[PDB]
Design a protein around this ligand. Structure first.
Ligand SMILES: [Mg+2]
Length: 393
């Protein structure tokens, strides 16, 4: 049985007609942000399906084509996720063994012309917008984000609370594989990379799914022992510190890089039939740090406006978060048409406890301390959707 890198290399070595079956090519893709969770989840789903299909858990229930895991960014952008690069290096997964947007385009182009391209979704529950023209059918979903209630016939269809999607993927496959210890060993570093970064080392956003996934990994990684030592948890701590420091490291990146490396885009519907195109960048350093590293406030804001225009956005929002002295802090910066941004912010400012520190809503660029440190992009987006629905048009 192949390890994860061996499986990926094997996929790369095959003709596309041996990956597709009866003129269906099946993939598994995460979300447009391509974070640790999206990448770990997609690779894990694809790998577990492969092991399941060739083994004896799937005796008298046959079938089962290969699933190509896709990371939904240009290959070159992987390097902006220094945490992910570290986890892959540790499992000896080479970038040339992975499949990015370019690879998915090559597959679509080189497959026979009547082949359907179907997708499992992990770490999202509707198809990333940029892939809507490539994916014919959604066949299955496992996710932990707000349920959009689409593709209700998907199999599986798991959209449940979880610190990490990777926990849900792992647990689903663990049951189907009857706890196969070799599989657990082979995926645990990648899985733990996602779970630990998502839960800040099992201290935040922890759900029953995460606790169970961690318990299963510990049981395998410890093996038969008389006494459980502190070593396993110490090793998880050192691993977490390595990944966290790297996620927190955006030194040397351009403003464009920083804005695009953890980014999501939406079209909100309002009272007008025209929607609001809005992008949200999640960033790991405070605005003052960003300004100092990028030629000062004015230079930085100009680069933001450039990014906005390039992505065709009515509104660009930056959400920063950091920790110092055991205290969490957040900021929210918004750029867009003065009319719309003032109305949006005025409608969410109480809930997010926003305090202006820069700019002016009448000017279309404004910067706020966000004293509601619990609200992440996952909450900010619904708050802004609700605000936008109340605007006159
Ligand atoms: Mg996730």
């Amino acid at each position: 049985r192949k390890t994860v890198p061996e499986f990926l290399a094997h996929l790369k070595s095959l003709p596309i007609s041996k990956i597709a079956s009866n003129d269906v090519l099946t993939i598994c893709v995460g979300n447009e942000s391509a974070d640790m969770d999206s990448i770990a989840s997609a690779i894990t789903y694809s790998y577990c399906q492969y092991i399941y299909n060739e083994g004896t858990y799937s005796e008298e229930k046959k079938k089962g084509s290969f699933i190509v895991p896709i990371i939904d960014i240009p290959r070159e952008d992987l390097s902006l996720r220094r945490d992910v690069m570290y986890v892959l290096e540790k499992l000896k997964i080479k970038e040339e063994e992975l499949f990015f947007i370019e690879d998915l385009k090559s597959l679509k182009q080189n497959v026979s012309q009547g082949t359907e391209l179907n997708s499992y979704l992990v770490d999202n529950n509707d198809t990333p917008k940029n892939l809507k023209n490539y994916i014919d059918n959604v066949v299955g979903i496992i996710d932990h984000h707000f349920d959009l209630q689409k593709h209700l016939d998907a199999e599986p269809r798991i959209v449940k609370v979880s610190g990490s999607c990777s926990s849900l993927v792992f647990n689903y496959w663990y049951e189907k594989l009857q706890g196969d210890r070799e599989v657990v060993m082979n995926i645990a570093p990648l899985l733990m990379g996602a779970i630990l970064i998502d839960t800040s080392n099992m201290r935040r956003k922890v759900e029953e799914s995460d606790k169970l996934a961690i318990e299963r990994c510990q049981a395998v990684l410890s093996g038969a022992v008389n006494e459980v030592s502190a070593q396993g948890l110490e090793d998880s701590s050192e691993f977490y510190k390595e990944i966290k420091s790297r996620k927190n490291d955006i030194k040397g990146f351009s403003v464009s890089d920083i804005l695009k490396k953890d980014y999501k885009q939406f079209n909100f519907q309002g009272k007008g039939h025209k929607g609001l195109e809005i992008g949200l960048s999640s960033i790991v350093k405070r605005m003052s740090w960003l300004f100092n590293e990028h030629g000062g406030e004015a230079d930085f804001v100009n680069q933001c406006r450039r990014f906005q225009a390039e992505r065709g956005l009515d509104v660009l929002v930056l959400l920063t978060s950091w920790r110092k002295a055991g205290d969490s802090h957040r900021e929210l910066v918004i750029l867009g048409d003065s009319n719309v941004v003032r109305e949006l912010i005025e409608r969410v400012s109480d809930k997010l406890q926003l305090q202006l520190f820069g700019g002016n809503l009448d000017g279309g660029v404004a910067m706020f301390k966000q004293l509601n440190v619990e609200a992440t992009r996952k909450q900010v987006v619904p708050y802004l959707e609700e605000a936008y629905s109340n605007l006159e048009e």
